[PDB]
Amino acid sequence: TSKKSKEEILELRAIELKHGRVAMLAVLGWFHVAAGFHIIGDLATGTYL
Amino acid sequence: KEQQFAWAKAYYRKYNQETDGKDPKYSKPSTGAGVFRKFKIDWPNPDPSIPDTTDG
Numbered sequence: 001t002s003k004k005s006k007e008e009i010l011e012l013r014a015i016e017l018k019h020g021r022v023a024m025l026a027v028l029g030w031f032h033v034a035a036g037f038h039i040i041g042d043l044a045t046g047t048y049l
Numbered sequence: 050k051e052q053q054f055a056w057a058k059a060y061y062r063k064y065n066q067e068t069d070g071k072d073p074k075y076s077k078p079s080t081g082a083g084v085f086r087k088f089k090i091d092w093p094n095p096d097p098s099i100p101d102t103t104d105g
């Protein structure tokens with residue numbers, strides 16, 4: 001960011017925040033499904049995923 | 050009157066049914082009878098304490 005302009009810095013922060021939020025939700029869902037608790041898939045496939 | 054009610058009884062026996070014929074399954078219990086697993090109500094992550102056998 002040393003040579004970037006303000007718009008580029010704001011876009012970098014937007015990318016960072018989108019990735020961070022997606023990653024937080026991803027970890028939540030990953031642990032949720034790794035604990036079992038995967039009902040949508042269970043019901044859709046008729047079997048325990 | 051005896052003949053009248055004899056004819057009435059004949060007509061009753063011919064045209065009337067004891068029961069509507071509803072499926073017996075709707076009368077059988079589901080919970081507490083030991084046959085819970087048949088209905089697959091709690092299949093995802095089933096409760097271990099409930100016996101797996103469906104014999105009742």
Ligand code: CLA
Nearest residue numbers: 022023025026028029030032033037038039040041042049
């Ligand atoms: C990065 C996020 C992310 C991604 C990519 C996925 C992807 C997937 N999940 Mg999900 N999941 C997530 C988060 C995520 N999950 C979270 C946070 C939870 C709750 C802890 C779950 C709980 C969950 C279960 C219980 C199951 C899945 C399953 C699945 C698969 C099928 C889709 C489905 O219906 O699940 C989605 C189900 C949900 C309950 C998702 C809830 C999402 C919350 C409410 C966040 C909403 C954010 C919102 C849109 C933000 C606003 C933005 C807007 C203003 C622009 C798929 C691979 C299935 C699977 O793989 O089974 C083997 C399955 O059974 N997920």
Ligand SMILES: CC1=C(C#C/C(C)=C/C=C/C(C)=C/C=C/C=C(C)/C=C/C=C(C)/C=C/[C@@]23O[C@]2(C)C[C@@H](O)CC3(C)C)C(C)(C)C[C@H](O)C1
Nearest residue numbers: 017018019020021022023025026039040041042043044045
């Ligand atoms: C009736 C029936 C069935 C059914 C059904 C139904 C109705 C199922 C419903 C499922 C449902 C309701 C599933 C929701 C998923 C939501 C997800 C994954 C959201 C992700 C959200 C994400 C990844 C968000 C990301 C971002 O927001 C972040 C973090 C920041 C923003 O800047 C940018 C974006 C927007 C990218 C069975 C049970 C399947 C089988 C049975 O036989 C018959």
